[PDB]
Amino acid sequence: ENDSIAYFDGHKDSVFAIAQHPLYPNIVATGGSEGDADDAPGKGYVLDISSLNPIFEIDGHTDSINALTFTLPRGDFLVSGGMDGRMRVYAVSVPQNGALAQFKFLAESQETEEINWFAPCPSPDHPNTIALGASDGSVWVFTLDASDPSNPVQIVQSYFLHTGPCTAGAWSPDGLLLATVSEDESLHVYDVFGVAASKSLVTDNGQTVVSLTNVDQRFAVEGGLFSVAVSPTGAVVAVGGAGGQIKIVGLPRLAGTILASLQIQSDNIESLAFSPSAPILAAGSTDGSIAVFDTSRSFALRRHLRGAHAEDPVVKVEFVKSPPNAAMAGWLLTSCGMDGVVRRWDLRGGGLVKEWKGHRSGQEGGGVLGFVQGETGERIVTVGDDAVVLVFEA
């Protein structure tokens, strides 16, 4: 069964990365591998989903493209990050009722050897700021200023606190704090713009408001941390890790106490998401289940969706920000998995809304490795291990 309304098969191998323009959800960039041979480079494309033909091509990566992001608030830049450690920065123009979006390569840098993720800063005060986490554990924050393309990239921060690979990062809603986690079990929440330090709310390293490591027995998740999310008020951060473990840690408002410890699921928590408007946290696990916790009730278990993606890993969960059906605002969760399926859930109960097939399953060389769904969730664009990009409608 194939439920897609459009597709893109331009990638020669697995597609690992996807990003979406924050103003124009039809503009999507995808990135991945051109093959498993050493002489096979990475490759990215930009698509307009409004068989798809790309409107731009991202070359220059000698290894797989692993991370992509458009900048906030307006998508003035598109940035790619590779397993070669290259960060390539493109300026983005979207004509009013001129024509197709246009892209211009501005700059390339190589601050790390391998980029694991990007996250754009949501602070309205600091437009075109992005963070990345790398295999060397470092976390970098960059600001992009198109004026002076002799140096359009400026370094806001370069943190070297994690030792092992930095697996995930999440900004607080006000964009002043950046929470990152590592394979070495540490959590650091950086005071990116110095505000916390000015209010005497940073730790002894002068850089974080929270720093927790393997030596902290109440916190340590044996086997590593792989996911992180920050609550919509910025009051807490959730970290997810090996063994199905989740830790909830307090943040200063603009701290570092364990507010709850969760272990309903049985294997790696690969994805965490707070609902933007309902008092719930969703967690996706390598064991194929999703668990939903009530954030106003000491993270009491609301529901355990076993076999949400059979016994195949749940790769990503994400709430629909503002669905057209406003009654469901905050309660609609989209998930994707190595079963090759995308699903959407109604989390009001204590619930499958839709499922979209088309990708091969993991055992056939497929699985869904990522997706975007815009603000409304009405179009879902996927990237697959089977080298295909699919478009579904809600």
Partner: peptide
Amino acid sequence: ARRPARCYRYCK
């Protein structure tokens, strides 16, 4: 080209 760490986590 290589596969990211997370893919190796998913695979078993």
